[PDB]
RNA sequence: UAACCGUAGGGGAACCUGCGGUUGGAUCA
RNA sequence: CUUGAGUCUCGUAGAGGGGGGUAGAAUUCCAGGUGUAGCGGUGAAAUGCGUAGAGAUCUGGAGGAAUACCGGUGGCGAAGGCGGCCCCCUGGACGAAGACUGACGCUCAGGUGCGAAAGCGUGGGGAGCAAACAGGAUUAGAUACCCUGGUAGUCCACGCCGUAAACGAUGUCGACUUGGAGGUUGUGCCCUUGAGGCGUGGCUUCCGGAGCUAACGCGUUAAGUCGACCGCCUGGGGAGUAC
């Protein structure tokens, strides 16, 4: 719905993405081709996922983009990216102006394909980008920071005012780059457990982890790991959360 | 509120008690309360009662 | 087959629906009616002339005894505080005393905030 | 406040004459009583602030009177502060 | 008026609901209205007068 | 001392104790340097509501003058006495006599 | 979805929700 | 010296404060009786609850919160705020005959203390309501409004936080300056023969004159005419932000 319309902003995003011939790029929500056109001009082929049948039909008749485009008229939420990576024969460079509504579930959907994604460049609500990148001991640090950082290097790109879109959104936007780790810095036996620990910790972020994770870790276990039970969810590092996930897997 | 009459008939007498409580102090409750909304609108509707 | 002879009749007059039960003297269920069960449902009920056909349905389930007289207990506001008593006066029943048993507290519990569109 | 059998009592102990309910020596002393007596009251309840406001009133009001005596007859001051065990 | 035993001169300032009659339809010098109501309250505890009516 | 006015209603099926109850209280008041300038037995009578069950109770007045101290002793013997259903005692408001 | 202030929590983003106060609220509420 | 200020006496009204009791209505829940296929909810709906018997109805019990009517253009408080009835401890305001002290007063940077709600700590409590959160619906979407639930919290004690459109958006104290209608409370007086009538104080509404004001409007409770002391402002953004 909120179509990117500012030319300078557009140029800045294209410059950041830096599409190169030979890369397999996939846009989620090409819309009115604000990014599709300039990105596609640098490529021989380009894949898009577009739910609006009206706008998809306009891409197909673009004289230069058309011949280059593979258009999937489906929902990205349940799109099999892992299978698309197999077809393109290489990890995917994903990009797009994402609707605020689906942005967080889509990111987790993409994260689950690990290896299959080279990188992601998404427009999101600015506060979402701040959480994604946040480190411990700050307000923005939460479960999303930890899960996102387990999977990826999180790289803020641009902040974008409402006036850059037509119609304008109600809140500031930002572009973030997400790069799945080539080498996972803190591997976890089973991610569902990491997901569970962070949910429990952050659902009670104004309590010490002694209290919020007391159903899962004794004070002795926490002390043994070098984790201070007087600390709260937001004081615990990504590394420590992963150490807790592995413990709970190697011991329960 | 207590009705009772001899000589079977459905006259009424009922709307007589309908002037002290009834659907009024009822709908008064119904939804939420008031707090500041009343002490104000109760002291503004009073202005109305002047002319 | 008990022949209660006379028994009060509660009229649970509400907004989204209304229901009247012709209980006995002590307060035992002898026959209850219901707008929701009176053909039309959804919300078409409520209306007075819609509840009357409901409570009147009792004279078909509680008629197995022989109620020669009965009082009326109207509780809560809504389109069914008058209609009910009327239909009952025509059904053939008698009357002994009309009264409103609507729960009118003294600022006890704090009602729901709700509605705000 | 204070009981008549007490108020009308003390007045006849500091008054340089009779029924001189005005005399500072009197009024002033009359204040200490209601003050000391209330200290036992404020010991309990505590949270009762609206009553202490009046307490503080008579306290400062009492002081406003002591300063006066010192500025009207040095003697009378030190001559009364003792009979009331004031200054503490 | 300042009492409750005078239950005789109270049933007039009420109704079938035992509710304290307003001062609007009384104009009881106000100052008296205050006293008149105070009685009906305390007097209800001695069961001298009723609170509601349905029970 | 300070005046008073206590009206206690004893259980309906314990009226016979009412007369005895009076002597105790009254005697105490007198033995407390107090005074008793009002008294009356209303006996049994219907109630507005079935206060503490039943629908009738025994009524009695007082309107003493004894010192608050000794009367505060009454609230206890009053509470710990299943006979009396309800207790209600107001303040002085100057000596009250006769009428009622 | 009257708005705003305080305070709290939550959310791509304006902002949503709760509690209290305000009129700097329209229509006879 | 006595008119300012204060003391004494005797009255008056008050949801002023702190403590402890206690009552009745309603909600929810637990149990049991009657009775039977719907209930609940919405603009509709759906989630939800129902044949393991709900809802309705009636009997008994448990518990917590708040006190209809009176209630008002009302009252009390420095402000914030304060509503059932009873007792205990306690503050201030006002009137009147008076009696007394004799300028002991006004203001007040710094200082001390009091402070809605939300929030915080320890320990209690927890009916209703309800941030979070979870379902259902609406919608292009709906991290909302609506619906079904619901945790902190709201309640108590004790300690902390000190903010609010903490507003009359109008500092405190005093003296002057046409009027009209009303409210509330004290007192004097009048065939007090009365509901009542005439004054004389306190507090308070609405209209409004002179004047003041940029206008709106304020107008003896002034934003009018003056005097004493204090706080504050000096273009908007950046910013009540950074350090």
């Amino acid at each position: 719905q909120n179509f990117l319309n500012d030319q300078f902003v557009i140029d800045s995003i294209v410059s950041a993405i830096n599409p190169q011939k030979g890369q397999a790029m996939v846009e989620i929500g090409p819309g009115l081709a604000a990014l599709t056109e300039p990105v596609g001009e640098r490529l021989d082929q380009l894949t898009v996922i577009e739910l609006d049948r009206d706008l998809a039909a306009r891409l197909q008749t673009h004289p230069f983009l058309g011949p280059k485009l593979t258009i999937y008229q489906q929902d990205a939420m349940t799109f099999n990216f892992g299978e698309l990576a197999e077809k393109m024969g290489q990890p995917l460079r994903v990009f797009g102006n994402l609707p605020y509504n689906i942005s967080t579930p889509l990111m987790f959907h993409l994260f689950s394909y690990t290896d299959a994604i080279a990188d992601m460049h998404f427009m999101l609500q600015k506060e979402v980008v701040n959480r994604l990148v946040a480190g411990p001991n700050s307000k923005a640090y939460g479960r999303l920071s930890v899960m996102a950082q387990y999977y990826c290097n999180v790289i803020p790109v641009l902040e974008v005012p409402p006036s850059a879109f037509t119609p304008p959104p109600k809140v500031d936007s930002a572009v973030v780059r997400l790069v799945p780790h080539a080498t996972m810095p803190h591997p976890v036996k089973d991610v569902r457990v990491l997901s569970r620990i962070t949910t429990e910790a952050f659902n009670q972020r104004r309590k010490t982890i002694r209290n919020s994770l007391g159903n899962l870790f004794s004070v002795e276990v926490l002390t043994g790991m070098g984790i201070d039970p007087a600390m709260r969810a937001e004081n615990i590092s990504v590394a420590q959360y992963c150490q807790m996930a592995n413990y709970l897997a190697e011991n329960a | 509120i207590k009705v009772r009459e001899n000589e079977p008939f459905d006259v009424a007498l009922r709307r007589f008690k309908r002037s002290c409580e009834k659907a009024g102090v009822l709908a008064e409750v119904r939804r939420r309360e008031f707090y500041e909304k009343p002490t104000t609108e109760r002291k503004r509707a009073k202005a109305s009662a002047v002319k | 087959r008990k022949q209660v002879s006379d028994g009060v009749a509660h009229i649970h007059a509400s907004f989204n629906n209304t229901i009247v039960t012709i209980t006995d003297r002590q307060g035992n269920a002898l026959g209850w009616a219901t707008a929701g069960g009176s053909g039309f449902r959804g919300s078409r009920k409520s209306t007075p002339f819609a509840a009357q056909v409901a409570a009147e349905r009792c004279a078909d389930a509680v008629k197995e005894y022989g109620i020669k007289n009965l009082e009326v207990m109207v509780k809560g506001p809504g389109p069914g505080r008058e209609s009910t008593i009327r239909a009952l006066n025509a059904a053939g029943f008698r009357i002994t005393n009309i009264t409103d048993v609507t729960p009118i507290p003294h600022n006890g519990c704090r009602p729901p905030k709700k509605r705000r569109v | 406040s204070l009981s008549t059998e007490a108020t009308a009592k003390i007045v006849s102990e500091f008054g340089r004459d009779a029924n001189d309910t005005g005399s500072t020596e009197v009024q002033v002393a009359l204040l200490t009583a209601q003050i000391n007596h209330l200290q036992g009251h404020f010991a309990e309840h505590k949270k009762d602030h609206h009553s202490r406001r009046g307490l503080l009133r008579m306290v400062s009001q009492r002081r406003k009177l002591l300063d006066y005596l010192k500025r009207k007859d040095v003697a009378r001051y030190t001559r009364l502060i003792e009979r009331l065990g004031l200054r503490r | 008026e300042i009492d409750y035993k005078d239950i005789a001169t109270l049933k007039n300032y009420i109704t079938e609901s035992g509710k304290i009659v307003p001062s609007r339809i009384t104009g009881t010098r106000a100052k008296y209205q205050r006293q008149l109501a105070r009685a009906i309250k305390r007097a209800r505890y001695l069961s001298l007068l009723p609170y509601t009516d349905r029970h | 001392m300070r005046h008073y006015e206590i009206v206690f209603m004893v259980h309906p099926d314990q009226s016979e104790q009412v007369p005895g109850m009076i002597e105790r209280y009254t005697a105490a008041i007198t033995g407390a340097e107090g005074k008793i300038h009002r008294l009356e037995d209303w006996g049994r009578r219907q109630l507005a509501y079935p206060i503490n069950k039943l629908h009738k109770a025994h009524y009695v007045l007082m309107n003493v003058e004894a010192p608050q101290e000794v009367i505060d002793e009454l609230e206890t013997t009053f509470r710990f006495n299943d006979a009396v259903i309800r207790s209600m005692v107001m303040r002085t408001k100057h000596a009250v006599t006769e009428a009622s």
Side-chain angles (χ1 to χ4, degrees), chain A residues 2-99 101-188 190-252, chain B, chain C, chain D, chain E, chain F:
Chain A
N2 301 97
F3 299 108
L4 186 61
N5 113 90
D6 192 276
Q7 189 60 54
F8 300 135
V9 171
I10 287 165
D11 283 9
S12 69
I13 298 176
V14 173
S15 172
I17 293 172
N18 186 24
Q20 290 300 326
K21 231 313 271 185
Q23 301 179 325
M25 307 227 58
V26 47
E27 191 174 12
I28 302 158
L32 296 166
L35 306 172
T36 326
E37 275 173 322
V39 170
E41 213 183 328
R42 297 228 211 143
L43 306 158
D44 284 351
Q45 261 83 37
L46 168 67
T47 298
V48 305
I49 305 166
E50 182 52 67
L51 256 191
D52 186 311
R53 286 195 194 288
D54 291 296
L55 305 183
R58 307 184 68 258
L59 296 173
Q60 200 182 106
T61 53
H62 190 293
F64 306 132
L65 224 29
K68 284 169 187 204
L69 278 185
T70 299
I71 302 152
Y72 291 102
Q73 294 178 79
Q74 71 196 61
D75 151 60
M77 201 44 69
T78 50
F79 181 89
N80 194 341
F81 293 93
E83 176 60 31
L84 180 61
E86 290 296 311
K87 289 182 196 159
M88 293 309 100
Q90 67 179 284
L92 309 169
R93 302 204 60 213
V94 183
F95 72 106
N97 187 24
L98 303 186
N101 198 53
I102 54 87
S103 68
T104 296
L106 178 52
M107 280 190 280
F108 282 93
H109 178 56
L110 286 157
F111 291 154
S112 76
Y113 291 106
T114 57
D115 261 17
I117 311 304
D119 73 342
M120 290 163 270
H121 276 92
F122 297 134
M123 182 77 82
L124 308 174
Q125 286 195 349
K126 183 187 71 180
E127 272 330 299
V128 170
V129 174
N130 291 340
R131 283 197 292 145
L132 287 172
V133 75
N137 320 308
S138 80
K139 232 147 39 161
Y141 192 62
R143 173 167 175 283
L144 176 56
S145 322
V146 179
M147 299 309 300
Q149 282 169 41
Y150 169 71
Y151 288 113
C152 302
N153 193 17
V154 177
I155 314 155
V157 185
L158 265 186
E159 256 158 29
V160 189
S163 66
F165 305 84
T166 306
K170 285 161 195 93
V171 76
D172 282 19
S173 286
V175 171
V176 68
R177 187 183 181 216
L178 297 178
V179 192
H181 297 289
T183 300
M184 302 283 279
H186 315 108
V188 161
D190 181 8
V191 306
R192 280 153 339 158
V193 172
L194 173 63
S195 176
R196 179 190 180 186
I197 295 161
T198 53
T199 292
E200 283 301 291
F202 284 102
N203 275 359
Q204 282 198 104
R205 82 143 55 211
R206 296 174 183 185
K207 290 286 159 58
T208 57
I209 53 158
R210 159 194 272 99
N211 183 322
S212 69
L213 293 185
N215 351 52
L216 297 168
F217 302 98
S218 57
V219 69
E220 287 81 5
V221 167
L222 290 177
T223 305
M225 292 200 291
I227 307 173
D228 190 343
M231 289 196 312
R232 299 164 330 285
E234 82 191 51
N235 298 143
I236 305 311
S237 69
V238 175
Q240 296 171 316
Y241 273 114
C242 290
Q243 189 191 0
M244 289 187 277
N246 282 326
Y247 182 92
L248 204 51
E250 277 137 51
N251 285 288
Chain B
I1 305 171
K2 206 68 186 174
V3 188
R4 176 202 172 177
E5 271 168 50
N6 204 329
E7 259 71 46
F9 45 34
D10 244 19
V11 45
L13 195 66
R14 303 105 212 185
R15 70 166 117 85
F16 274 52
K17 255 93 72 175
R18 187 193 173 212
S19 62
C20 38
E21 304 228 286
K22 261 270 169 169
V25 71
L26 256 161
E28 186 198 298
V29 171
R30 205 201 308 200
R31 242 208 94 219
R32 48 77 196 184
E33 285 276 67
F34 257 112
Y35 323 115
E36 74 77 44
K37 290 189 290 186
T39 200
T40 52
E41 192 66 326
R42 246 263 172 70
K43 283 172 175 47
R44 185 181 261 198
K46 68 99 166 179
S48 195
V50 67
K51 206 250 282 192
Chain C
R1 301 78 180 64
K2 180 187 184 185
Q3 306 290 326
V4 185
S5 294
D6 40 26
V8 296
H10 298 73
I11 298 156
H12 198 56
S14 181
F15 283 73
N16 308 77
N17 187 98
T18 290
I19 42 181
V20 178
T21 174
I22 338 293
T23 174
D24 89 329
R25 48 253 297 202
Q26 331 299 167
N28 301 72
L30 295 176
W32 60 275
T34 183
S38 290
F40 50 82
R41 217 302 212 70
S43 201
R44 248 181 177 189
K45 53 269 184 54
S46 178
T47 160
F49 254 69
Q52 58 181 58
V53 78
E56 99 170 25
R57 215 187 277 296
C58 284
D60 237 345
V62 223
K63 232 55 157 59
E64 280 300 298
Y65 308 90
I67 310 293
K68 318 166 186 171
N69 171 52
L70 85 176
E71 286 151 299
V72 259
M73 225 102 295
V74 221
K75 186 165 76 173
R81 310 172 97 291
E82 170 174 357
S83 168
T84 172
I85 315 175
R86 270 212 313 91
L88 273 264
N89 173 279
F93 298 87
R94 215 68 177 190
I95 191 65
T96 0
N97 146 57
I98 301 178
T99 37
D100 173 55
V101 294
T102 303
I104 25 76
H106 294 18
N107 211 51
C109 295
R110 185 262 199 58
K113 192 168 171 74
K114 237 171 173 168
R115 320 262 66 180
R116 191 177 64 273
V117 284
Chain D
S1 177
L2 206 161
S3 72
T4 66
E5 270 193 301
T7 13
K9 168 183 58 42
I10 171 173
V11 64
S12 312
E13 300 218 9
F14 294 100
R16 301 178 84 175
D17 19 285
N19 211 66
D20 37 35
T21 54
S23 166
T24 57
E25 218 101 349
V26 179
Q27 162 194 151
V28 176
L30 183 65
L31 268 301
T32 303
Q34 190 189 312
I35 282 186
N36 293 156
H37 167 47
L38 278 165
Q39 175 156 164
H41 156 47
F42 290 94
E44 188 178 328
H45 311 83
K46 317 170 295 167
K47 293 164 290 181
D48 183 16
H49 295 298
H50 298 75
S51 283
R52 189 134 53 199
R53 231 288 296 281
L55 166 66
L56 292 171
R57 187 274 173 70
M58 33 204 261
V59 174
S60 58
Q61 168 169 34
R62 170 181 68 186
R63 201 170 72 273
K64 263 99 151 288
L65 264 296
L66 296 167
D67 292 56
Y68 173 79
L69 271 308
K70 262 260 68 60
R71 304 192 277 79
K72 289 294 167 174
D73 186 284
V74 185
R76 285 218 289 153
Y77 182 73
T78 49
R79 287 175 160 205
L80 169 155
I81 52 170
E82 197 62 28
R83 278 182 59 189
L84 284 66
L86 298 150
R87 193 55 47 248
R88 340 286 185 176
Chain E
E1 276 189 45
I2 29 176
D3 71 297
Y4 40 96
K5 52 170 193 186
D6 196 354
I7 174 180
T9 322
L10 269 68
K11 303 192 288 181
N12 11 47
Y13 302 86
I14 55 161
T15 180
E16 286 286 77
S17 63
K19 296 184 57 167
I20 292 175
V21 297
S23 199
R24 312 178 49 191
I25 31 67
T26 305
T28 172
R29 320 285 188 110
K31 177 177 155 72
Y32 298 3
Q33 176 60 64
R34 321 173 101 295
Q35 304 188 180
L36 193 103
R38 221 160 301 166
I40 294 177
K41 275 184 195 62
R42 69 156 60 93
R44 285 184 241 183
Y45 302 78
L46 276 42
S47 212
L48 306 170
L49 276 75
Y51 274 104
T52 171
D53 177 24
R54 270 151 273 194
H55 184 299
Chain F
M1 286 155 247
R2 187 176 313 158
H3 311 166
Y4 279 103
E5 178 195 21
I6 165 65
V7 47
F8 61 85
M9 30 187 87
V10 199
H11 194 292
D13 279 340
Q14 275 258 96
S15 168
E16 69 277 9
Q17 174 181 152
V18 173
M21 286 170 55
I22 306 172
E23 278 191 2
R24 269 112 56 175
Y25 305 152
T26 54
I29 286 163
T30 302
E33 304 282 48
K35 295 189 161 208
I36 311 167
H37 9 88
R38 176 91 105 62
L39 222 305
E40 59 198 22
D41 198 71
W42 302 5
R44 285 167 283 176
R45 162 194 159 166
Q46 88 125 184
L47 311 166
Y49 47 109
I51 183 147
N52 213 60
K53 230 288 106 297
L54 230 292
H55 19 273
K56 267 157 288 177
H58 199 304
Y59 286 43
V60 177
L61 239 300
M62 213 78 90
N63 296 62
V64 201
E65 180 251 57
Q68 45 274 290
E69 200 279 70
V70 294
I71 87 105
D72 207 89
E73 318 265 301
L74 208 56
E75 281 68 294
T76 1
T77 57
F78 256 146
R79 293 289 97 160
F80 294 140
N81 193 334
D82 312 283
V84 43
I85 290 176
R86 259 236 76 194
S87 224
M88 194 283 109
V89 47
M90 274 171 48
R91 85 161 198 179
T92 162
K93 218 299 174 184
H94 274 183
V96 198
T97 310
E98 213 190 294
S100 282

